[PDB]
Design a binder for this molecule. Structure first.
Ligand code: J5G
Length: 225
């Protein structure tokens, strides 16, 4: 369980911040709203890995929702082609992601899904697919990211340097784009060491979330309500 942990009680993370009044206060407050957490490895890939595992975990046993997600995943090669990626170069990454979606349908266990996401090879192939899809989605909608996010930014350079490469950290743009690309609704809870209110953001605004993440020390962990 080196990439995605077993579930633990929320208060188990007090030990990561001993004798810190603000982190203790915020973790205690968090525990009033969430019961359990899974930790993810801090290797620069943790957003993609956490969102992938947690969303597919949320689909287990839901036959209509699996059928609709599989239908969307079958179309994602066309998003990659339209942004200029070549099939022979994304084939290995696409096939790894389609495979774990079929596992959710056919096997349907938590234990089998957690084994794929802790397999360094399968798991890294899944993360690389998610990063190429994020890049394609932004490239194909460059005017939307310039209109709504930053009129001055260089979209192609941003995708090349801060989305495609393994171990590159995410910001709001990547979270928004991968949410939109796979129709995944998520809520991110923010715990920093400033003396402020515990707070959260929903992607997209006003959706009912599938996935809850905790963002703390530049790390995304998985929450359960
Ligand atoms: C999400 C992610 O990988 N975060 C992170 C923090 C540190 C340290 O390394 N990676």
């Amino acid at each position: 369980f080196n990439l995605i942990s077993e579930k633990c009680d929320i208060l188990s993370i007090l030990r990561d911040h001993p004798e810190n009044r603000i982190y203790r206060r915020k973790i205690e407050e968090l525990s009033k709203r969430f019961t359990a957490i899974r930790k993810t490895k801090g290797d620069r890939n943790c957003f993609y890995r956490a969102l992938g595992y947690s969303y597919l975990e949320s689909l287990l046993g839901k036959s209509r929702e699996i059928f609709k997600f599989k239908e969307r995943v079958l179309q994602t090669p066309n998003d990659l082609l339209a942004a200029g990626f070549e099939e022979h170069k994304f084939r290995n990454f696409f096939n790894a992601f389609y495979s774990v979606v079929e596992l959710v349908e056919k096997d349907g266990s938590v234990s089998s899904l957690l084994k794929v996401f802790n397999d360094q090879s399968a798991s890294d192939h899944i993360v690389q697919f998610l990063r190429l899809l994020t890049s394609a989605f932004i490239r194909n909608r460059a005017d939307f990211f310039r209109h709504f996010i930053d009129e001055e930014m260089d979209i192609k350079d941003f995708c090349t340097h801060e989305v495609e490469p393994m171990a590159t950290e995410c910001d709001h743009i990547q979270i928004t784009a991968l949410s939109q690309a796979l129709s995944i609704a998520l809520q991110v809870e923010y715990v920093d060491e400033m003396d402020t209110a515990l707070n959260h953001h929903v992607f997209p605004e006003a959706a009912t979330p599938s996935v809850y993440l905790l963002y703390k020390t530049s790390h995304y962990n998985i929450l359960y309500a």
